[PDB]
Symmetry: D3
Subunit: 244 residues, 6 copies
């Protein structure tokens, strides 16, 4: 119903705990959620009292993907202009999260499907419950994986695993997701919150500027030659010298 | 002896089971096999009753590599023209398989060596028997790995593993091959056929066009920046909308 | 004290065993060590009696990184010219090792931190003791990882692991380092020397030219498209035909 | 100049959107106000069925003198990082919108084009200059790097030597030199510019609009691909155009 | 035009293979028949010890007007995907053969060069045009993307602005404009073209054929490499040439 | 020519380092002796507070005829691989030093510039030629690939067709042709060259030296990046320049 209600958050000990807030719709990404998430992330980003952001979900799912009724079906009804506007709302918030000024953690307790892979990749670190499920079920509906999820699978997992994942549309458990490096770790659901809290409260004790430069450097040197990456990392250290 | 006899196949339940058919020569890739394999793959590719291709081998080996007598030794005897013609016959069928219209599965029950790595990579998915052996033994004969196998090792396995594999020329078991993501899975030899059959018969139940677009997208976004891969995957979905 | 004493070596059975030799300073890379290491590596490289190089360390550490007193602190005291001269001394020896004419093995028995990642990556193969520790603790001192270590973590380990490694500054054990393919293998410390000796004495029995071409090809095809890598590997084999 | 909505003007005539920078007394410098209004104007026009081509011009004697130093660079680091990052995003976002615009785009450069103007200059598909136009990256003289990705604009459009002199020396190129080094398509006397741009925009609106979009996007994209990858990509583009038509 | 083997002609004179497109009444449009015969002709000639250089010319007033719409685009989607993919492969395969040819290659472009002709134009190492030659990508006017990777050909050879106008506007370049924007090496009056191409082909056959091959391949390859990677690659190329000689 | 320290000369006048190749009777061919001395000279000058710009010229009628065949190619494979690799490293290392020099660099090319001279030519940020200067890659005539990464130099500076003819045919370009194909910035009569180079070097020393360094490095670097990655990179460069100033 109300756009302002699709996303919730709490600041606790300098950690922004941000939640998808459509628990009855498996936290599907509707245009309303896409606009509100950009709004929340934008307002939190440069707060001097927010050192780390955690992205979680209300109810049994983390994020079941794009809301096919509001996002794919209802949008296309107003044509190209509608499709493009709704596309831009989803892509721009995934990008703002991916390049966030503060370190970002995905806390993935349940369903993570399709167009949820964008936000999953946009989080620097990711912790799953064993009972979480990760899947690209789009092949079974006759479409390509949502929201660049193919590129997410290829940049995080071994090529053979990404290929099976996309082609067969079967789910990975929390443990399998960790094993194939889609996420950092898997643990029982009742341990997840405390491990994430511990990771978040460790990062806020570091120099926040250093953590930003260091996480951007990992993402960036992935797309350079070794020889270009060496010169780049020196140029980044020079810029870090100026922020600090 | 006869070029037409170097390759065998059977269509069963819309699956093309294609076999290397030189069981007494460990299914080594001779110029004759290279020309016949292109011929079979070309004729099967666009059949409306062929939804998936499986590449297997007769006898104890999957493929022991290039046939040094027919392919390397006897060819060089007619010089550059001979070398180039024989090279093109091997590379062009690996490429036709790698970009095949239908999904492709390697069913690897035994020896997979050297220039077999091209066909192995060209198959979208790969299942091995535990008793299978994978190796790049070329370093021990004083040459570089056959048929782009160095690039196959680097695109599928962790750099440190690819380096050992190439430099030491030792074999990986079925289990090791799975562990380092050269293949999707390893299982006892007496379970292999049934697992592959199950995978193949699952894919033919999907939209064949979607599976094609989805497998090409995995291979392609491996060689793009994240930002270019996002725009590309939208352009692919537009093309899929037209095939279907 | 004496620049000539910062590095030690022994030739045994055509293997150059090269050691960092500042055991009391955890083999930290000082400008003196950087100049002497280039000198030793340069003199050993083209010896017809040296078939493989092993890089080890005296005392409890392999290499704790850059010597903050001599390399970072004392250098900056003579400004840009001093910083640049000291940078070039470290980068040029890592590069000479990375492209070494002979195969290179890292024998890592203990601490491997920060700017040690350059030399670690520059070794083609790497074997660790279980009791070894690998870390990028720089985030905790407010700086980026030393000496391109970010790019080393990204080229060897899964992206999610590299990200945690850089951001949290926690150590990986020998076993974890092997599991995430920072090194080839981990084993108890009392087995390390004998495994490395065995690997080294296996490589010197191969055609030394072939091993060189084969190790350079792994490093190079990592930064090419599959289609460019195929043509390149043929051009390399043509050059190998000429050396031999 | 001072109310946000006045900082940009447009008219649509015969399916051509004529968009003008509208801070003529400030030589059309890109202030945060102009950056926000330009995005809103380009966004509203992009998908209209009655807009076939967009022309980007400027009021007064400048096309665009670059970024408004007083509002965009100062009154922003006033609010620290958060203000710098917001003003940066407003500028980079509308250049990106124009660069990947649904409709073909034309720069009509009659006068001064400096610094951060190079982003919009490159974001236009085609560009036509007056002989009396002047193009420059004077930022080296102010002790800073060229604004708004302009170094990359000079490297993608001009020969490397020319780009190198352009960045290092901070000297101006005439309209004729900008045509010669392919910063723009053509240069002509100022009194002929509008008639030539009008003729190009009218030629484009007669073509299949969806074909023009796929074809202009193809040129931009295959610049960053290997030949072998570009061959496949262009086939995939044609299949999407088949659907979109 | 109608029997497959008649669709291409050649003569070898003084170690120069003079290959001509031979559908002059169809302005040498690339039909599946011509595509298959061209591969067979280029394949037979490539490794002859008596062929030092290949010149690609055309009979009649066209070099190549592009793809044969009637045979290559229609009578192929007649057989659905399988026919489209077979006709595509026949065209792309012989362009690739010519692009990586063992011997140096020269385009001799006297007349019309349009659309899918750009693939063979780029596959030639060198190109010499008549002043009266015309180069164009008119596909935008027919509602389709340029045929046969031609967008990439225009982007790799010409400045981006020029490539952009070329694709979007579908207007022709004269021989003189094609030389100016480096689509071709040189343009000259039609009555001088053959004598100039002959002089270049004769200059090349006096050089070390293996050296010419490694050197032309090096130019093509280092275009897609970083400077630092190109430095190593060129050393590795010299070591292969040492062996091959 | 014969004592190592005599193989290079320089003077520093008004914060310009004028460095000259000094084997005039050997047309300034790059021998191992010259390669070692050039590194030592460039290394000593780079970080002086009184050196704002470096000009690389040559004594006698040549700028640089390329590598010294007699010392660099022979008397090196005399010592097998170890000698080849040492002489190679001496040449490639000082070209790299000049290419990434702390101060701006200018080639002053009055005469012959051939082969392995192309590495230093490209390593200079700017280049000014005499009309009577001659640029060539004649290595094809000697049966070898162009020396010292020169193929890559021709591909990064000139249009691909021009680079292809240059490598394959081994013919010379005049100073005027080298300016036209953007191998150099400008060509002028030999009696004007020194005054023009002096004027450029004096213009650069008035600018903020740290700004010139970041800006010239930006041009070189964003050539090997996507547009989207270049936009972020240039922001990161500005933040480093903020610190370094």
């Amino acid at each position: 119903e109300r756009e302002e209600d699709t996303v919730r958050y709490e600041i606790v000990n300098n950690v922004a705990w941000v939640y998808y807030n459509r628990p009855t719709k498996r936290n599907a990404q509707s245009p309303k959620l896409n606009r509100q998430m950009l709004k929340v992330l934008t307002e939190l980003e440069f707060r001097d009292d927010v050192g780390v952001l955690v992205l979680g979900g209300e109810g049994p799912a983390w994020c079941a993907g794009m809301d096919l009724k509001e996002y794919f079906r209802e949008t296309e009804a107003e044509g190209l202009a509608g499709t493009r506007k709704a596309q831009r709302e989803a892509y721009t918030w995934w990008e703002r999260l991916r390049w966030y000024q503060k370190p970002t953690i995905a806390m993935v307790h349940g369903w993570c499907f399709g167009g949820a892979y964008g936000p999953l990749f946009a989080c620097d670190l990711a912790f799953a419950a064993d009972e979480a499920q990760f899947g690209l079920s789009e092949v079974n509906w006759g479409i390509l994986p949502g929201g660049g999820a193919t590129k997410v699978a290829v940049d995080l997992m071994p090529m053979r695993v990404a290929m099976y994942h996309a082609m067969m549309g079967e789910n990975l458990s929390g443990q399998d997701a960790a094993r194939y490096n889609l996420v950092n770790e898997s643990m029982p659901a009742d341990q997840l919150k405390a491990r994430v809290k511990q990771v978040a409260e460790t990062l806020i004790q570091k120099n926040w500027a250093t953590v930003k430069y260091t996480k951007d450097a990992v993402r960036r040197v992935k797309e350079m030659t070794y020889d270009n990456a060496e010169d780049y990392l020196i140029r980044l250290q020079e810029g870090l010298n100026w922020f600090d």
